[PDB]
């Protein structure tokens, strides 16, 4: 998640790979949309608890 804060701020890092990490996070946040709970909580897989 915090790879976002690492792209420009370092001045040494290779931001190509964290720019790809956000590409993975574009699926990660949908996984979180699928790992959410209806009431508002979070778990490994989601609701029905």
């Amino acid at each position: 998640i915090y790879v976002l804060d690492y792209l420009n701020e370092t001045q040494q890092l290779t931001p190509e790979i964290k720019s790809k990490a956000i590409g993975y996070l574009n699926t990660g946040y949908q996984r979180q949309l699928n790992y959410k709970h209806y009431d508002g909580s979070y778990s490994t897989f989601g609701e029905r608890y």
């Binding site: 290779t14 190509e16 790979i17 790809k20 590409g23 993975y24």
Partner: protein
């Protein structure tokens, strides 16, 4: 006297913002010719209106260009309007426009890499011609095989038509091919991969040497086999090379011991050098029906006992064809005008035909039988006097046509090689032309080459004049390169067969030199044909490297002296040649960068070509002709007169007999890589002075092998330059 003859040859393939030649023929003077090629549009907007001044008996070729096309490619019906004062001619044809982009390539030190070091690479840019090109790019990115970009840099700009880099790498990759991507503004993509693996360095290696192909009739044979722990330590021990005809496609449902023949040979290893063994070819009895003699070895080491095994050349070579001859220079185009000279040799096993074996030269349907024999220095340089129709076909080893096909029942057939050729005619209704034998031999550069062209004039010249013109043109992968005008005071009614013709060779040509030469006649007929010649690799900025001569390890002081054109931005990849001797540089060379240039030659009709005609395409134009009949609209033949413009790649709008359409009615029928130290040695960029910049090279001691410099000079003062190979020990 004559007629009006205009013939404005045109290569349909275009190139944007780069010079493409356009010429025009005119002769046998009349009133006024100001022909103009205009891409026919509903309005004069897309029309590339190229009004060319056209006087008679001239070749002043004009390199008219075009701006960017709307799409990448497009079809536009183009007509040359023969702009007479009272005569206008129109024949449309679609133009194969193409928004051709400038070419770029990538350079890499190696492809294999050890996990953990820094991969460093270069990318280069040029244009249609072979000069640098500084140009921006949308993006570049190294790719990991999981569909993710492992490296990426953004919208850089080239400093000298190229740019270097240095990229890290994690020591845990997917051990496999990693790819680099580029995308131009139009979307041109280039590829250059690199593999990675934490490959163990084995301290053990073994090798078998056996001839690949071997005919029936041989006296003896050598097989060099040797197990050496680091490829440079000739060990003692004992080795045995065993070979066995087991079967051709054995099933082993039979379960019988598959071995049919077996010939075993054993010998103690040699301590100096790597061992040699002699085997004979008769003991095998390598008979026709007899089956696959697998070529394997077994090595046992004394004093250590760690007996590893290797199956080397294990799959043998079924030579179902024995005494396999071939062709050499079977003439590209048969013509009556000179005795053509096709050529044939023979290869067999080691590659030595029998000295002075007499051959059975039968070019049949001409009935000119004249046996010959292979000379020690010459091949068969033969000719057959044809006195017959277009249909001809030749062959040697012509005791038959088929062996004696009573049957094979697919059991097994006795096929030896026989070199049979079928040929066809220049569809020359004039029966007059020039035949040009091919220059398919060595061709050093930086000189001029007089071609040999021999011709005829059947029935003499019917009227002719004192002077008939014979121009010769070199198309070059979609465009012409040079001009040539020559003539000869034509004897009226007697045949002569010596024509002089020459052209210089430097550079700036397709890999094939598509010369053409034609016979402009006063009778509205013109006969010529293609003339292909090799283009050998010879570059603009010739450069030679030089080093402080080979001595011991610790002399870190050294030189890497390079001498090229006075100005260049040049690469200095002084590296090992171990990593080239284990794998030749098929990707990086002079001839490489020559043949990486795509669109080698867009010949004939391309796929995107849309049909073109005005009246000829009209099926069944069937009335009022003063002949026995009236047959296809096509110019159909294998070597028809317009097939020569087709094999060029150029069209024409001509009052003589040229064009045919396509759509319209035509008849038919009549594992693992052995490895040493991958530690790269030199990597830096410089800029040559005039006297030759002499960079002090560094010795990398504790590494003795063959060493190499994959240098690369690029410059707009002398074009690109490469020291393709120079040795350091």
């Amino acid at each position: 006297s004559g007629k009006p003859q205009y013939m404005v040859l045109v290569p349909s393939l275009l190139h944007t913002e780069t010079t493409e030649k356009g010429c025009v023929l005119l002769s046998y003077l009349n009133e006024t010719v100001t022909v103009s090629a205009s891409l026919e549009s509903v309005r004069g907007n897309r029309s590339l209106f190229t009004d060319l001044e056209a006087e008679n008996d001239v070749l002043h070729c004009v390199a008219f260009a075009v701006p960017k096309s709307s799409s990448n490619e497009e079809v536009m019906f183009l007509t040359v309007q023969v702009k007479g004062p009272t005569q206008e001619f129109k024949k449309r044809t679609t133009v194969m426009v193409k928004n051709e982009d400038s070419l770029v390539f990538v350079q890499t030190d190696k492809s294999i890499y050890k996990p953990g070091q820094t991969v460093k690479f270069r990318v280069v840019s040029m244009d249609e011609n072979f000069h640098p090109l500084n140009e921006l790019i949308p993006l570049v990115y190294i790719q990991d095989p999981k569909g993710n970009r492992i490296a990426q840099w953004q919208s850089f700009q080239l400093e000298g038509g190229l740019k270097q880099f240095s990229f890290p790498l994690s020591s845990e990759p997917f051990q496999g091919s990693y790819k680099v991507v580029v995308q131009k503004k139009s979307g041109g993509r280039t590829e250059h991969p690199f593999t990675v693996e934490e490959f163990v360095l084995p301290k053990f290696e073994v090798q078998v040497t056996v001839p690949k192909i071997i005919t029936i009739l041989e006296e003896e044979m050598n097989v060099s086999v040797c197990g050496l722990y680091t490829y440079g330590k000739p060990v003692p021990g004992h080795v045995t090379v065993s070979i066995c005809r087991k079967y051709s496609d054995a099933s082993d449902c039979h379960g019988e011991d598959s071995q049919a023949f077996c010939e075993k040979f054993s010998g103690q290893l040699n301590s100096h050098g790597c061992f040699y063994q002699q085997v004979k070819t008769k003991v095998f009895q390598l008979k026709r029906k007899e089956y696959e003699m697998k070529l394997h070895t077994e090595a046992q080491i004394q004093e250590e006992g760690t007996v590893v095994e290797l199956t080397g050349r294990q799959s043998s070579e079924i030579t179902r064809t024995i005494t396999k001859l071939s062709f050499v220079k079977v003439d590209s185009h048969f013509r009556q005008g000179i005795p053509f000279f096709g050529q044939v040799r023979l290869v067999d096993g080691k590659g030595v035909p029998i000295p002075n074996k007499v051959i059975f030269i039968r070019g049949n349907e001409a009935n000119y039988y004249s046996n010959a024999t292979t000379d020690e220095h010459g091949l068969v340089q033969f000719s057959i006097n044809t006195t017959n129709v277009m249909g001809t076909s030749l062959t040697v080893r012509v005791n038959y046509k088929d062996r004696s096909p009573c049957y094979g029942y697919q059991w097994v057939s006795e096929e030896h090689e026989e070199a049979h050729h079928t040929a066809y005619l220049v569809f020359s209704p004039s029966k007059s032309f020039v035949h040009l034998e091919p220059m398919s031999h060595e061709l050093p550069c930086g000189h001029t080459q007089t071609v040999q062209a021999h011709y005829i004039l059947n029935g003499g010249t019917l009227l002719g004049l004192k002077k008939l013109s014979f121009y010769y043109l070199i198309m070059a992968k979609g465009g012409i390169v040079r001009t040539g005008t020559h003539g000869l005071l034509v004897k009226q009614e007697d045949m002569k067969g010596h024509f002089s013709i020459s052209i210089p060779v430097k550079s700036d040509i397709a890999p094939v030199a598509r010369l053409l030469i034609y016979a402009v006649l006063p009778t509205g007929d013109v006969i010529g044909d293609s003339a292909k010649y090799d283009v050998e690799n010879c570059l603009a900025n010739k450069v030679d490297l030089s080093f402080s001569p080979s001595q011991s390890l610790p002399a870190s002081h050294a030189h890497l002296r390079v001498t090229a054109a006075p100005q260049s931005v040049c690469a200095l990849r002084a590296v090992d040649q171990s990593v080239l001797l284990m794998k030749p540089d098929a990707e990086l060379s002079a001839s490489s960068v020559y043949n990486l240039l795509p669109e080698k030659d867009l010949t004939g009709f391309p796929g995107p070509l849309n049909d073109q005609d005005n009246e000829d395409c009209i099926n069944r134009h069937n009335v009022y002709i003063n002949g026995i009949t009236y047959t296809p609209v096509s110019s159909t033949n294998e070597k028809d007169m317009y097939s020569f413009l087709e094999d060029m790649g150029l069209k024409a709008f001509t009052n003589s007999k040229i064009r045919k359409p396509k759509m319209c009615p035509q008849l038919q029928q009549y594992e693992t890589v052995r490895k040493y130290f991958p530690e790269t040695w030199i990597w830096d960029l410089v800029v040559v002075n005039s006297a030759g910049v002499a960079e002090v090279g560094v010795t990398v001691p504790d590494t003795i092998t063959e060493w190499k410099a994959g240098a690369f000079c690029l410059s707009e003062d002398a074009g690109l330059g490469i020291s393709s190979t120079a040795s350091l020990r």
